């Protein structure tokens, strides 16, 4: 109802469900890996992937501290009613 899906594409990829209710402290597990069902803080979610990099790709400039630049809404919500709404909520959650 209130939780919405999110994703990141750092050192792999990972899709998750974000519940703004639980995001009560910087380190508060509010996101759950749709694969392993584990609950992660945003910064730790950005480090969590079940795929390993191609090692034909090289990754420059990554830092978990900058998770706010890397975390987006799930592509499911793209070209849909809900695209523009979820981004502001997400942006609001980045401010805190």
């Amino acid at each position: 109802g209130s939780a919405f899906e999110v994703e990141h594409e750092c050192l792999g990829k990972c899709q998750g469900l974000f519940a703004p209710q639980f995001y009560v402290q910087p380190d508060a597990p509010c996101i759950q890996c749709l694969e392993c069902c584990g609950m992660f803080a945003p910064q730790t979610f950005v480090m969590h992937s079940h795929r390993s990099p191609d090692k034909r790709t090289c990754h420059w400039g990554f830092e978990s501290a900058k998770w706010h630049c890397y975390l987006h809404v799930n592509q499911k919500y793209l070209g849909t009613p809900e695209e523009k709404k979820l981004k502001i909520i997400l942006e609001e959650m980045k401010e805190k």
Partner: protein, 192 residues
Amino acid sequence: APEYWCSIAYFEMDVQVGETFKVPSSCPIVTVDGYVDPSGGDRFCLGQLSNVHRTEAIERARLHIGKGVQLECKGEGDVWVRCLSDHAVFVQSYYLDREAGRAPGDAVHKIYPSAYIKVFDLRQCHRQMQQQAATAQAAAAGVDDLRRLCILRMSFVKGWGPDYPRQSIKETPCWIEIHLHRALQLLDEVLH
């Protein structure tokens, strides 16, 4: 010396879209983004460009270009990229191939949002240039290859890998090729 310090060609898959953007030597920092001001000068916008053969997929991708990237020419002709966009960008750079210990052209370099990474060194390029030429000459007693030292290519949004659904950069929905002019003048002298 050169009038423009680089020039930039935008493509959607294997079709060039728009005219080639030339960057004056007095604009050491050039922004390439997804917005629409057609001005010229220190900013090359891609939002406004038309393409009769555009697809749904290319349209989709163009939405993520957003603030795009800056390409900065530092001092003695070194080139840095800063990824202002909120999606990562992917780069072909022989320098990055070298820095990471990969064979030339045998890697793609993902640059992450907010990152500020150095993607070309003029002196190294010039050295590699002089040296390969002087040796191949004296062995007897890669023009198309040396050329590629003076050029970067970058894809906004999507990478291309073996390793990826798409194999080459001309299969990506929106990318750019960037010819660095001082490097090209130096190779011209070398070839004479």
